[model samples]
Target chain A: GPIGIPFPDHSSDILSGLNEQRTQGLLCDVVILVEGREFPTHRSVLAACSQYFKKLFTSQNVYEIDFVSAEALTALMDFAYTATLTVSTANVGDILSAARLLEIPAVSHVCADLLDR
Target chain B: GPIGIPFPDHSSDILSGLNEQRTQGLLCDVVILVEGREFPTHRSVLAACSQYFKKLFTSQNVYEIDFVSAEALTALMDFAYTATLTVSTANVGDILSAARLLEIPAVSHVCADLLDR
Candidate 1:
């Protein structure tokens, strides 16, 4: 049965391309200062993915976060960029806490699920 | 070969979802006026897809154009949303011209290729 025009699913392509851009630091318009270090990233991507970032970036360019460790923040950003994560027991608590603060329920849920298992 | 984790190619899903949003006029933050008619669209998607739009929206809003027909503009937006087109002989030239003006080389090139055939 023909269900109209069929097109290749490029979901992975889109996410991986964005991840590649993140790795390349391409078009990173906003800088997030975690502790003393800086992470360059796109405002729209962050905003689209996280409500906390969306509201914060809508008005400000430089965001300073102190609660989350650099590693945990980086892990959350990795998920934001790539739509995937490699959650481990060591960083799970930090990431879960960070995800909750950032209002990213998906990552928080994943961490919760992982902890539940 | 044992490679890596395989993810579904949701490219069409993404595009169609965006197209659905477009059709519903959901979250259309900007409007494009062609020949006295208004078409609501997203600034980010337009900016992401076209250099002309990227520059325009970065500085200002409410872009008014006189050259491109509403039909041609609609066709261009359809491509922007769905990543597909129904290029016929009648509207190809108008779309080609609009694409050039909009600095969308892909659409322009496709129209040119269609004309060449």
Candidate 2:
């Protein structure tokens, strides 16, 4: 599916910068933190996003993507030859930290790979 | 469900950096980006995370969370009385950016809030 992804932070902003080719129309998908005693937060966001934006937004395409921590992503890039997946999602800010932590080249390149189509 | 949240970037580090009150033992949650031409990427991540962490992780609880952009979070903070949910997950690094954008107190407070139990 076609989508527009935005960088809520500058660290991630660099990731989006790498793949100007892709992410042609994805919304500048930002990360939000919710504080509560419930579990439907994600579903709630999907529902709310669909309703709030109307035309540009639709939770229909929003799905939990398997993005490996920078540590794992590194292992995949280094050892796993046929890395079919990255594993799970990291913290919203952890992306850059992981990149910094692992010393991965083109942290944005990794982001490109994650969003690759 | 109980989960650990991680700090992936400096800005978000500040977020997690906050809330000495909460996040006493939560794992630093990191965000990951998946690039692909498929939709099952997230589901795959769920499975991988389940297998990888085994004891500490499970896709069962790793639902798609809604974390709004800093732009929206600001508006909510400024106008919204309760300031419900943040919206959807931001990039691992963007959490910091979003936090920086609005100049809200305690980015970690937000993270703690998102992860409130």
Candidate 3:
């Protein structure tokens, strides 16, 4: 008899990610990710979204961000969470590539609601 | 009668730059010229630069900038007058050295005033 990894036998049956069924009891709300005065439109859009979903939104679930300083980004990284978002922003072109990488379900659902356009 | 360009005779008078008169100004604060929020002391240094020059500073003179987006740099380029600060920020190291190629009186003075830290 040999010892084996616990989940190896069930790997074939494992699900890829949460399906719509998982969201049945979950909540949805709006978040605001602002940059600066230059982005008034972005700020206003987030404001309007929050207003419309006020009943359903939770303060803890909602987030607001300003990426003007790296300090802000560092705070975002520190929040303890089960998942991670490690998209690379090494150069100019990485902006869009990072967005594409997040299109996958697990990563998207974990971070998408908090993401800024 | 032979006529020549007037400046050819004045090449010797064309100055390299003022030994003390020229200032590259700051980066983030219209003259805050610093980048990176993780470096908070950098911001304080620029703030001190403004405070010391408070009396001599004209409201029309000092510049404050946040180059988070491309729009900020574009605004700087548009309002720019005679003193040109066309820097080739090819990648990294050029940021400071680009400030050096800018050497001259007429070229620096006029555009220098409205410039921010």
Candidate 4:
């Protein structure tokens, strides 16, 4: 691995977000039901992150997202919105799987980078 | 004004694009009837976003909030929903003037904050 003043990979405004808005919980369009817990999100935010997520919105579906563990989905969503992905020994496999179905390959990339060590 | 973070689809006009055609509509328990258009968004999100939004969806139920333009309102909605606020020289004047209706000084402070640069 090479590192110096690393190049910036974002496509311009990808990181420019309303950190305050997320903190304030405004305008979340979807009520995400995961396991027994419910989370709120903006359809646009998830759509921006994943191809599958691009079409996650529907009339009868917040869908319970039971295919992945709530903890894994939370990790992925945090990466989507905050641009930070965290992986550890316990759930990295599930997180990567979640990332794959979500079409957020970036999570895989981050985990692969960890493998570099 | 301060600009960064790629707006998922933000550009000039900064309005109407994200509101899309008619929504498929789900999980939302409140309505925002504005001066120009009746916007659809979530109650908890609005409540968490601004003092004005919190009160607007009170026990009195939905009421018309006509203090700002639908255009400005949508831009704020974009920021809240997607976490990206596109503040170009093109519309900051109008947006800043309108953001005055609520204490969303994040926009105002962001302008001044970026100005400090």
Candidate 5:
């Protein structure tokens, strides 16, 4: 066994900051439109996290884009920002589809891993 | 505040994973060269957190890059992954310069705030 001093880690704080960004919709540069409803997010975050978004953002100066539904895209963005996804039977399929389309292997991998077990 | 059953947060766990990545150099897609020493990291993580890296990685297929020094770049990468920094008078200036080069305002802002206090 090892002895050491214990202190609170900053992971929660960082997650909390991203959560604040999501809740306050602060510093979001792009709008993802679903059924005429708009959801704001950072283009760099999306592009960095997903190749689909990388290509989309680089090729065009998009002010807004369309998606399947506000719910799925919203949940996807939450997964991207928070790194924790609340997946249930209700939204699992929808989220999986969205995740695959967005090319976010983390979400898809988690979903598949959960389903495989 | 509403009263409810208290639960442990998962923030520490995520931070732990990222720290492991930093330590183990797991799944690192890019190698940053500082004075001929190699530092491995994930391109997505770098780009997701820094605008300079986002533009750099997108525009070119860079397998390696040069930074100011191994120590400063290593510390900066640790900050990017863990979101917690250990800064002191010794390396504060170096870290700040590296943070600026990488366009990580979070690090710069924290350093400035601490110095201003």
Candidate 6:
């Protein structure tokens, strides 16, 4: 019989560690550009979280994006790596717009929930 | 004041989705070899979970590792992606050995706990 050994923190630890690795700029294969600011990220992280980047990075790296603020892009990337998106009165508009453009409904739902509250 | 809008399941969601992507070999940036079998994986995921892989994949991809059984390697990888490892009397020995070699203390700890129980 196969036993089930569950480590509850494993998934959180992996995400947290990956975010730290991103901060150190290690194993980052793609450089996404928005308003001349470059965000070095793991392509798999983005593609796993967003369809837009999945197709975009499927071809390769070093991409330039527009119509999205750098702050919004940063939030999206954070959401991509951490799976949590912070939405508040200060940046809900930008985040919602960016979420819609990026096709990340999870973030959009966060923003939508914020707006509704 | 910045409100902490923590989505509890975000990290787990990311790991789960990334593992799914891995199953499809989508966005896999590296190939790992153990005993003539090829495992396509996201380098960041492994690097995040294992120091040995972190250093190895840091230089890049397509690596072959020895002294570890394929079953053990597979178990370690399943633990890496899912954060949960199943250990039974039949395979605890192999998993522990592989966990030690991979420098993944978490998996080692699981195997240890299973042995003690």
Highest DockQ: which candidate? 6
Tens-place lDDT per residue, model 4, A1-117, is: 011111122212322333334545554556778888777766655654666866654325365787889998877766565555656766677777787788766566655555455
Q: Give per-model TM-scores.
A: 0.62, 0.15, 0.16, 0.53, 0.50, 0.93
- The list of candidate 5 runs beyond 4 A from truth reads A1-117, B1-8, B60-64
* Weakest lDDT window of 10 consecutive positions for candidate 5 chain B: B1-10
Task: Evaluate candidate 6 by giving its C-alpha RMSD to the native, one decimal.
Answer: 1.9
Top candidate on lDDT is 6
**Predicted candidate 6 versus true structure: per-residue lDDT over A1-117, tens digit per residue:** 888788888888899888988899888888889999999888888877777877776665688998799988988888777766655688888888988888887888778876786
Per-residue CA lDDT of model 2 for A56-75, tens digit only, reads: 22223242223435344332
Candidate 3 lDDT, A1-117, residue by residue in tens: 111112221111111111111122111122334443111111111211223222222124334443223332322221101122333323212322232332222323333433342
DockQ of every model listed? Answer: 0.15, 0.02, 0.01, 0.06, 0.10, 0.69
Is model 3 an incorrect, acceptable, medium or high docking prediction? incorrect
Off by over 4 Å in 2: A1-117, B1-80, B91-95, B112-117
Calculate the i-RMS of every candidate, to one decimal place.
Answer: 6.6, 19.5, 32.3, 15.3, 9.1, 1.8
- DockQ rank order: 6, 1, 5, 4, 2, 3
Candidate 4: count of backbone clashes, pairs at least 3 residues apart or interchain: 6
lDDT of 6 by residue, B8-103 (tens): 888887888899988888888888899999899988888889988887777646878788988888888888888777667988988988888889
Pairwise lDDT winner, candidates 2 and 5 = 5
Candidate with the greatest TM-score versus the true structure: 6
Poorest 10 consecutive residues of model 6 chain A by lDDT? Answer: A79-88
Please list the residue runs of candidate 3 whose C-alpha ends up more than 4 Å from where it truly belongs after superposition: A1-117, B5-15, B18-20, B23-32, B35-59, B68-117
lDDT of every model, 2 decimals: 0.66, 0.29, 0.23, 0.56, 0.62, 0.82
Better of 3 and 4 by lDDT: 4
Better of 2 and 4 by TM-score: 4
lDDT of 2 at B84: 29
Residues B49-100 of candidate 5 have per-residue lDDT tens digits of 6778767765622355565667778777776666556666777887778888
Instruction: Write one digit per residue (lDDT tens) for candidate 1, span B1-117.
Output: 211212232334444544555576654567789988787776656765677876776563367878788887987787676666556676678788989998876678767876786
Please state the error at residue B4 of candidate 3 in Å: 2.3
